[model samples]
Target: DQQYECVAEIGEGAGKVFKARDLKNGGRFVALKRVRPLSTIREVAVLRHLETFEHPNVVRLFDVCTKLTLVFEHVDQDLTTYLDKVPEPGVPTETIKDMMFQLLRGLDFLHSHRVVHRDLKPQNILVTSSGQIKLADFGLAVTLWYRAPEVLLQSSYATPVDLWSVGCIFAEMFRRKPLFRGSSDVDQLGKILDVIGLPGEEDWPRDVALPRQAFHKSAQPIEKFVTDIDELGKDLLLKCLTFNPAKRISAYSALSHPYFQ
Candidate 1:
């Protein structure tokens, strides 16, 4: 606690996050995330392992304090706050393209390292002053609206789930609002099915408790919802939101998509 001075409490709930000044580092600003006792070890381990080869898009872990507080390089704002501040016409196209590219690149790094960021919501994504994307909050995660179909179905899942979230955030960039606003798990799946359309029998996971037959909605054109993106961007977004996790676009492949070129 003596190494840093808490400037203000920036966040609360699952854990407390404070905007602190690192006294030893020329008073540099940093974020101090205090986690629950049980979660501290696992979160620290993951951050340390990922820090071995630091990527610009991932938030930097500066230090760990004795009281279970994790120190991180301070970023200007989370994606949620950034989107909220984007004006009338919404975030510019070129900027969205750049942000998406950085997002996928960071995600690719995490996936290649065999780490799956189970929670990939806007709030979990930090935006630096220079407009770089910093993926954060890896400990415990979720926002039901960003959940993938397989997850809602209670089927086994992996890194592909993060791509599903990228898809949601991609669309949110254009609309400046969440793509799906489901009231519950079932409703969230329904909202997704409404946009992506019902999956064919083979595409549906048989091990899941929820039957595909339960949803009666047909697929709506992606453009109908995310009206501002170009054709290539739409194509990439669709690939990210595919119903079958096995067939979903991997982050490495997504980086080379024509949308980025």
Candidate 2:
């Protein structure tokens, strides 16, 4: 601790970032996240399981301490900053593809291990000048905008929710804006229904109950807004955004799509 110099405060409350430079590690920079002690042991258990996978796209967990502090390899910036600064037309196709591929690859690994990254958004994804993409920030990740319908409905959950978030991320990177920008859970579902259309009971086939809302109609096809993207991109987004959790494509299956090729 004596040799590490705190550079900046990166988080808040129980969860925060202490950007540190370590003299012991050749003056290397690292992100030390301070979290509150867990009585539930849920996040800690997931992270322990995640550490065994060692996938490149997932943020590298360098170390975890007894004090509920997590040490991670430093990443230069997040997708939020990058997207916010993007010019009107948005990032290049190749850049978006690379980012999506990396995200899916990491997601595939997590799903294969039976862990759902409840939070998958631009702010939680990290970027590098060298084009490396890393998934980060697992705290407070739950069913919502980036989260899947099953989560929003508070019905059932599986790995498919992660796919939903990936689709949201893909749309954001392509359009350079959030795909569903809703204020609350109700409004969020409204945004989802607005874009995805109100799924008929036959649509899900899972017997889930949807909460009452303001509107129940499809606003416009995803193609209307994303005509500029290639067919593969459009196809993948729709697959992930499927109304039914069972119908949603798996991470492994998504990577096999032609968009990656």
Candidate 3:
């Protein structure tokens, strides 16, 4: 086949991404991946779960090779590059609205299915030539993470974690700067306080007794954010960023907010 030709390598993965051609099949250009999966449980589950997403804004999985590597439709660019590279991004507001709307749609689908994209970041959103936004990378995705307070405090975290990243993404979309690029958890907390201010005791129900009490002090009041959301859209961003999981707006509600509408 004229299409199965190796053109070049483009990605860093289990090994490397080789460019393969699909000649008789119509000269298709595809990325070849050789992943080490038996030991990579997260990658396996993440890819399998991401297969559930099929929105136009969300990229489709072309195929899974040997249940390890995924063949994905190549995207011209990703949001991360834009944010990282653009000196002063003049990205049109229309594009922002499109991307933001697409993001909410995708997140709404995930949250409804009890899925949580634990690592929602700019790097995870890809843009097609037509400017459609797609979500990628689900290695840390979780489901029903915000059920019981004790359970939330016990291990891992909640979907609100995804919301946290969404706020960061939204902020980046606005300021073109990472909302809270903290080196560590404490650092992330500091960044949150710096931008949105801290939360109050009433904001998070009995949050003081949580397992990670050492990291968060109940006495510390929620920092008042300079951001005042006039429209429901900005409010969604504010809600996603609430440190108190109890108070943070649910992904469903946020998705339904006028922000994405």
Candidate 4:
């Protein structure tokens, strides 16, 4: 309150993000995320782990204050707004490719650094006026729709769920809608099974958390709705959305995929 002029409230909850200006730095604007005690401790610890990694695609954490707040570089808008404001409702393939590359690049950094960004959604992704995409938000990041199979099964999960979330994000970027629109976790798993079909032993060599027998019918053609996407694009999207986390492509491999090359 004394140093930063709280311009406006941009977000709320355990970690409330505000648009504020640094009064000491000639009114330099910054995103001030004032977190509650619980969220503040964990988010700050995760951020400190990220401080060593240098990546432009990742959001920059400038200062960690004892007042249970963290400062960050401000971005003009979030990906949710950026997508809605597009005139044609669809972005250029080149633009999508570049954005995806940046995302994967950041994923590589996070995963390789032994960190898994449990939250990867459009609202958590920030877009600069320069077309740069910066990943943001780490509070309450556990997933549901973007959740991997193991996560849905109440089993342990790792970096794969993050990739799954990225796949969901990729789909929304092209179609301007969520690929799996489910109200609950079971509903979400059903939506996934409807598209990718039930995972069998071949897909899940290890003990599968969920079996195909529980869900009836077969895989529906997901591409029927995503007709605008190229063959390569669809292939890559499905790979990320794989039912078996082990089979899902890694960040490095995904960056080298034909969709990008």
Candidate 5:
């Protein structure tokens, strides 16, 4: 606290994030994320490990203080704010392609390191002045709408969960609004089934507590929901949003999809 002076409170929720001036660094700006007391040290460890890679798409953690405050390279704004400030018709196709490419690169890095970002949303994604995408908030995380069907079913999850989130965010980029607005886990599954269709008995995981019979809905065309995207874009989004986690596209593979080329 003595070394860095808080310039302002930029964010708040489970914890607070402040824009601070690093006194030892010629008053350069940095983001200070202060987690609530007794919070698990998992995020710190995760950030520390990721720091070694220094991937451009991942937020850089400069230091961690004894009080559980984390110092990160300050980016301009969150993806939510960036999207809100865009003009009508939403983000451009070329720019969206580039953004998704960068986002996928970050996810690929995390998956390669055996890290799964449980929570991924626009608010957790940082955007720089140069239009770079930086994944943030590594701690246990989620926003229901971005959750995969398997996760909603309370089944085991893995890297595919993050892909599902990227899928939701992918559509949100084109729609300028969340693809699914579910009030509950059940409702969320209903929304997903409505778009992706009910998984066949063969595809549904028998180990899940929630039975596949519980949901009954036909799938709608992806174009109907996320308009203005090209066929290749729609294909990529569907792969990411696959109902079966096993069938969902992996971040590394998604990066090489024809949509990106």
Candidate 6:
């Protein structure tokens, strides 16, 4: 049976993007990705790298046609889209837990194989049939974002950069809004402090290395405000977003959260 019925174009991806019917065999649908291999690096890499380590949380890439278009399972909508228009009943605690689990599980699997999903925003994740989540977008991904003080200070690029994005994502999921979307890194970090509090010298290897790392006031403890969110088991979320690369939680640990089971 044909999986998804063509619906409409929902995104602005050049030459690629579509909205389709959610086949009941599957509840929602996915966008068939069509783009140049060179121009869309992350998309090409993830679609290729992930196939090597199959996991339930990661969206299954069924096939790649002629190295041009890729066929993937239909996931109806992204987390951003879902939360933006959470149905009349609205998103529930259990539902949010499910999405968090899927994202962490997918990350853990990829990280185990020396991979990192650098751009893991809510928009990069899809909502699945059983109301689960799947990590999407792999073009900008790498093993980690950075390690040395010079790299961290001079530039905001590193290997496990994806972990930071994951942390930002969790904050958004619980906050029901974007976490770090400032015009500059400083503003983004401000959003982070607005939620998780602040990072200390002990929390990071190069605490002072960050060009934008600054504290306007004494380090104040940030409190959890997610009434609707069940915290998704804090340990996993905290580790993925640690300021120190060495102290950062590996994706594998995120999968082992007590709440997931």
In candidate 3, stretches whose alpha carbon ends up further than 4 angstroms from where it belongs are 1-24, 37-53, 84-89, 139-156, 202-230
- Give the TM-scores of the predictions, in the order they appear: 0.94, 0.88, 0.72, 0.90, 0.94, 0.70
Task: Please name the candidate that would achieve the greatest TM-score relative to the true structure.
Answer: 1
Candidate 3 lDDT over residue span 1-261, tens digit each: 223466777655325555666564576766555454343676556556767756675667676655346566666567977656655544566566668778877776777666676656676587666778888655431222112232334444666667666666776676675545566444445445555543564554454344233343332222223232236546676677676776777767776777665
Error of 1 at 35 (Å): 1.7
lDDT (C-alpha, whole model) for all candidates: 0.89, 0.78, 0.59, 0.79, 0.88, 0.59
Worst 10 residues of 2 by lDDT: 205-214
Question: To one decimal, what is the Cα RMSD in angstroms of model 1 from the true structure?
Answer: 1.8
* Per-residue lDDT value at 206 in model 3: 51
Q: Report model 6's TM-score to 2 decimal places.
A: 0.70
Give the winner by lDDT: 1 or 2. 1
Cα deviation at 128, candidate 5, in Å, is 0.2
Query: What is the per-residue lDDT of model 5 for residues 1-261, given as tens digits with 9 covering 90 to 100?
Result: 788999999878767889999999988899998865233666567778889989999988888898478899988899999999999878989999999999999999999988898888998899999999999877534359988888888876799999999999999999889999898999998888888888889888878767888877787889998989999999999999988889999999999999988
Cα error of candidate 4 at position 78, Å: 1.1
Q: Mind giving the per-residue lDDT tens digits that candidate 2 earns over 1-261?
A: 565678897656426788888667898888887765353377677886687777798778877767467778888889989988878777988989988899889888878777777767787789977888988876323335587777777777778888988898888787777778777777787788888888865654344465443355854778776657788898889999998888899999998999998
The TM-score-based order of candidates, best leading, equals 1, 5, 4, 2, 3, 6
Q: 1-261 in candidate 1: lDDT tens per residue? A: 789999998878657899999999999999998765546466578778888778999999898877477899998799999999988899999989999999999999999987888878999799999899999877443369899999999895799999999999999999899999999999999988988889899999887779988888787888989988999999999999999999999999999999998
Better candidate by TM-score, 1 or 6: 1
After best superposition, candidate 5 residue 102: deviation in angstroms?
0.2
Please identify model 4 stretches exceeding 4 Å from their true place: 37-46, 139-143, 201-212
Q: Is candidate 3 or candidate 4 better by lDDT?
A: 4
State how far residue 134 of model 1 sits from its true place (Å): 0.7
RMSD of each: 1.8, 2.8, 5.8, 2.7, 2.0, 5.7
In angstroms, how far off is 230's CA in candidate 4? 1.2
Candidate 6: residue 206 lDDT (0-100): 40
